[PDB]
């Protein structure tokens, strides 16, 4: 639904790299370069953003 606040395996905080991730992808950067530029070194964190599906943007479209 919404970005998890902390990576499940480690506990690293990834809930503040969602908008930065989206901004570096709009600038032309690959998902690899983008996840690198955010400080997500170990692949447990990289999967937390790489495979996130933002469904809070589709629920926030039906009437109040």
């Amino acid at each position: 639904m919404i970005i998890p606040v902390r990576c499940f395996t480690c506990g690293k905080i990834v809930g503040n790299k969602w908008e930065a991730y989206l901004g570096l992808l709009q600038a032309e950067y690959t998902e690899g370069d983008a996840l690198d530029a955010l400080g997500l070194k170990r692949y447990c964190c990289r999967r937390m953003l790489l495979a996130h599906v933002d469904l809070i943007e589709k629920l926030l479209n039906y009437a109040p």
């Binding site: 690899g32 996840l35 690198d36 070194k41 170990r42 692949y43 990289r46």
Partner: protein, 51 residues
Amino acid sequence: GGLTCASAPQGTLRILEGPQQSLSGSPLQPIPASPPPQIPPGLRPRFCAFG
């Protein structure tokens, strides 16, 4: 002055309309076969050890 049976026909013709076959080219697929999954060029390591 009536109609009488005449001589038996000597043959029969059966007509049908038929078109012909073209050359065998056998063009199986636009982009054919199962194209293989493959390596992204260069790639580079996306991880390092500590120290």
